[PDB]
Amino acid sequence: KNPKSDKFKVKRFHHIEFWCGDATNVARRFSWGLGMRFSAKSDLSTGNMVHASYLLTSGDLRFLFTAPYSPSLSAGEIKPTTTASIPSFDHGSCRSFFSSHGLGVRAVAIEVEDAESAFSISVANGAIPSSPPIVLNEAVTIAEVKLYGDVVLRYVSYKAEFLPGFERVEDASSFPLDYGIRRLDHAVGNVPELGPALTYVAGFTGFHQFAESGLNSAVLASNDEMVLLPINEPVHGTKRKSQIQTYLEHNEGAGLQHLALMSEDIFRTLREMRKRSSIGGFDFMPSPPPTYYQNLKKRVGDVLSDDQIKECEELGILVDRDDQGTLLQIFTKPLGDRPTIFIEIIQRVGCMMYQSGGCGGFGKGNFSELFKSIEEYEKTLE
Template sequence: MPPTFFHSLPRVGLNFLDHCVGNQPDLQMAPAVEWYENILKFHRFWSVDDSMIHTEYSALRSIVVTNFEETIKMPINEPASSNKKAVSQIQEFVDYYGGSGVQHIALNTTDIITAIEALRARGCEFLSIPSSYYDNLRQRLSVSSMKIKEDMDRLQKLHILVDFDENGYLLQIFSKPCQDRPTLFLEIIQRQNHQGFGAGNFKALFESIELEQTKRGNLFYENVKDGQHK
């Protein structure tokens, strides 16, 4: 077969769909979860509320459902109110998407550094993470028994997030929206004996998304109406 343009692109090395995240309008998460439980016989795998996932401006609630074998995982989110009347990333998605839908698709890799370098070379854009996140991460790792095999400087350069517990760690990064509307985006994730979803990174991720919302003029309700700028 003669070489093509695609043969000249760097290989990414994505293996399978790790999980798929759905966003629901306010107070619609529980009915959606019940549908998965009653119709597909899924069960609850993990959950968090707005006391755990929040920033100065916004918050969310999330329940992860999975099949009996726990091979299919579906986090389901809904927005939580803010005392500063900011637009949660979940609410922004619902406004621009026109209702509930798939917020992001997570793709698994065994070599996230190579994968992200290849995706950036192909033109993919990812969220930026401040250097203060990595300063804090290095401090937390210095008093932990967990050792990260990957070079921390390369992870920081590529804006890859790290979450860990006593059993293992995961590496993850999130793309910018795949189109001009702030709806679907991608996650690339590498797991090292860790089956979580990056709860330790939610605040950093939220703050990065809120920065993008600010650039779009969508962070506060007075700037947004029915998914459109005033």
Template sequence: LNADSPINEHIVKHGDGVKVVALWVEDATKSFEETTKRGARPFMEPTVEKDEFGEVVRSGIYTYGETVHIFVERKNYNGVFLPGYKEWKSDYNPEPVGLKYIDHMVGNVGWNEMNTWVKWYEDVMGFVNFLSFDDKQIHTEYSALMSKVMSNGNGRIKFPINEPAEGAKRSQIEEYLDFYNGPGVQHIAIATDDIIATVSQLKARGVEFLSAPPKAYYEAIPERLGDHMAMMKEDISELEKLAIMIDADEEGYLLQIFTKPVEDRPTLFYEIIQRMGARGFGAGNFKALFESIEREQELRGTL
């Protein structure tokens, strides 16, 4: 990186993290014009980039903190990624672990900012709030958070937005905001069709995940899944051994696990998720994740 690069400045301030959340659109120029007309702060005017494989149009706007959304129009491009990028060949070719696509990305914002950004996504992006969790649902004896999940019209894009809530000690959202120096992307969730196989392979390659919920969590799975237990294919003891969490909504169930932070700051981490009909997020898993991160906070001495 060049010393005067905007990304270099971002890394100095925030550490490793997410600067750009890119969205594939039909018309990047129209997306830019419409969102800025609705009040979005511009980041990048529509720009055409070309090479021998065609052309890509990109534009961008700011969202929470210093995070930006880049609109990518690539209907006239058939290259490997973007103009200027070449296919990379290497002798190092590990077998795929079954990761498919980004299921959702979660943002952490400051005190009393969640509803501001919910309204921004509604007014500027045309998203809807299809799920909410408050501090009565997501809390421990020490801390709490609130969250609202924003989604686009077809439900393929999901952006949960978290904010801190009052508690006896510093919540994990406050910890993130302190170490990241402001709002930003908390974690990226990647989908798989076989979470047991994916997690087993990732663990074998050294990926570290958050500690498992207590045994009572797994004993309560039949009650938590209700009628969905009949369609459950996974063995509960195998899920417990791998620390995979399971929850349900009205349409099905889902399995999730979360990595530890990927750098020395307790900021960005990853989630592996497998959906078995469920479209949303269960409150049980949300609370279990909150408790797992809080246990890590306690070990770090930052609770």
């Protein structure tokens, strides 16, 4: 059931902003590891004395990396005279966020029809305001409300090129990397209590609920279900410790857990990312045992051929299935020092109408299949 109860007009995921200690080094690592091009900048060379911000793109996926300069460079500015290109930025907020959480996502940005109206409706319906609507060069409007922890949901609306004050990046420093990633599929939060978190977000957006493992979870979705916001809470006192609880402890509370990036060819994406894992890119979780891939034939043998199942095994890809579609997924090890944020690469098969969002689910069924698969241990014991 989709009651289409969005309280304002939501278009698509727009960008994700990481708050960094040094934006240059994180952006360069992510660019090489994920195959994202340098496409825009706002920094000292563009007249920004407040923060350094670098934009990477791959298809419609936009990753923004921002770090503060010395407050001394902008000591004489006030908000009416600021050189910052992102008006919500604050030196103290950014340093406090990073000191408290380490490297991670500050902003989940969605494009809306009217960011001022989205902000107003959201706050009227319970959203805690974070940054009021600011109109940039009479062209772009940006506003922010609190989502969970110190993560904000950022609204952006365009009258008619990322943000004013950003410059397109010099061709020489913009190598056209591309490993196949095309857009953000979903963005997932970890919280101590799922119930109140869902009630708060669903309350102010009108997003509806989208149709033993250490977690309980639920997914909020926009009218066309292309903006997907799962939220997890821990399940305490199990056999092994909950990964959600470990996250909360190492992150100092709620925050963004993972970003799921849709690829238009997950085989190529994973080949390219895995070649770079040990030369500056990203590491992947340990692959499932061969029994997992033998079990794939019975589960998805009508969707994937033997060779494609063999290719999944070569690359460590997980496979799950809905009553409507199929999901190919894999998870990176944490992106930084702390066992907190990580990335999921995904590709979805089915639900052709365009492909409907969330086709195939989120891989909940792979918790059971992975554990059952560990029966490779019992088979090796023989």
